[PDB]
Amino acid sequence: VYAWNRKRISNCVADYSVLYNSASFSTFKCYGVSPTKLNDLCFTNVYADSFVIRGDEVRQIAPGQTGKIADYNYKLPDDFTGCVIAWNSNNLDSKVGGNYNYRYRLFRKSNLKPFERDISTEIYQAGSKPCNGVEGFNCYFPLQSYGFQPTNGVGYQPYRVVVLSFELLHAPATVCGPKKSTNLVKNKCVNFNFNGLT
């Protein structure tokens, strides 16, 4: 989550109906757009932000949330449009001895901007005493690992979260829905849909 992966999606036709109709996702929650209207609109600036978090932290992947990974790992803007996708991954991203490959930023001086990534492995000064880049008393590494075990209860089990981020109509669009194009008629009153513009 501190180094969440951002992938650009462009120049493709996207069928979001296979995402709504799939029951694999525990949370399929969209904010600035209806989930069922995604096949009827055209988009550009589509971004997929992929990371792994806890079970109780899936509420913090939302606009306007106060939280820990919201402030120091992954921040969403107040005017965010898109969909947050979360599904349980205890069968894949957990080990009986402890899966420690997923890390979060426990310590930071200030909250992040929306869509800001911090991968800097610099030390934090948690006390009055300066640390000088060396661990010690009140000097801790900012990145700490999750202790994922399959025997743990819900709320702490690993969840895979993908955030789809869009922009609405304010640019030429390259990602569209599976709606078929009709022929054009001249000099008649029609209700048209040009790339999501109705």
Binding site: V33, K37, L41, D79, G196, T198
Partner: protein, 50 residues
């Protein structure tokens, strides 16, 4: 500027119409100022609010 009294009335009426037309471009706190965009993007429970 001889006929300024009539031109003031004409300008005031045209300016009032222009302001009234310009006010459609404001979203007033909604996600968009275009009704078609809201009706094509959202379900009726939240489109009702917008």
């Amino acid at each position: 500027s001889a006929l300024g009294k009539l031109q003031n009335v004409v300008n005031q009426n045209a300016q009032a119409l222009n302001t009234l037309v310009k006010q459609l471009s404001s979203n007033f706190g909604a996600i968009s100022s275009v009704l078609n965009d809201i009706l094509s993007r959202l379900d009726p429970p939240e489109a009702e609010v917008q």
